Design a protein around this ligand. Structure first.
Ligand SMILES: [Cl-]
Length: 240
């Protein structure tokens, strides 16, 4: 997250860290949202590689013992069937991970609330992106979970020529674009939390930023629209 602030430890309890095994250690690669005690929602592009993945819930500082972490293997990966790694702009950047064990809920570990199906946020709706992604374009991952206020940019504006054009689809949510704050590599898969009717819900799954850089004016961070996939998610969880 570029231009973020450190999140309080119990602010975003559904945020998880999706990590892969590298040597005798684990590396954070993406965020995700805990949606069931044994299911995580993340981006399909995060699980394109044939890696060994684990999920960390109750994580705050990737480099320090927080005393709240729960580490669980990923037992099954269900990527949206229309996902195409060669075309992130087509959308469908979403995947569900069945965890090997059910995690324990507490103030640091909670299920993310998802929007009702079809919900679209009004332009400029208040949201926060959270994650341990790069804190600068071509930078380094954060140690501590970051949050950045990223108001939505509606489809009409987001898909206009000076923004993302045809690259953005109505199955996505754009947010930010102020040139200061944004998602960045390593935030992928994580949530876009937006305040609606007093409650934060996870309206987006971080999907992509410009190839030019993370915080690029008029290139808001683009997220998979969670509300476009409610039926899909339910169908996956019910059959697995
Ligand atoms: Cl949360």
């Amino acid at each position: 997250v570029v231009g973020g602030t450190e999140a309080q430890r119990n602010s975003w309890p559904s945020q998880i860290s999706l990590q892969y095994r590298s040597g005798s250690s684990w590396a954070h690669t993406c965020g995700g949202t805990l949606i069931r005690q044994n299911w995580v929602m993340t981006a399909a592009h995060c699980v394109d590689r044939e890696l060994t993945f684990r999920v960390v819930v109750g994580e705050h500082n990737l480099n320090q013992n927080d005393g709240t972490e729960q580490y669980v293997g990923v037992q099954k990966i269900v990527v949206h069937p229309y996902w195409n790694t060669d075309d992130v702009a087509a959308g469908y950047d979403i995947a569900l991970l069945r965890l090997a064990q059910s995690v324990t809920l507490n103030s640091y570990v909670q299920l993310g609330v998802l929007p009702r199906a079809g919900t679209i946020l009004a332009n400029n709706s208040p949201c926060y992106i959270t994650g341990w992604g790069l804190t600068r374009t071509n930078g380094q991952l954060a140690q501590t979970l970051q949050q950045a206020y990223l108001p939505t940019v509606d489809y009409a504006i987001c898909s206009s020529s000076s923004y993302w054009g045809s690259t953005v689809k109505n199955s996505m949510v754009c947010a930010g674009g102020d040139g200061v704050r944004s998602g960045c590599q390593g935030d992928s898969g994580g949530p876009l939390h937006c305040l609606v009717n007093g409650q934060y819900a996870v309206h987006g799954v971080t999907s992509f930023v410009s190839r030019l850089g993370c915080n690029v004016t008029r290139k808001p961070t683009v997220f998979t629209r969670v509300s476009a996939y409610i039926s899909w998610i339910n169908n996956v969880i019910a059959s697995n």
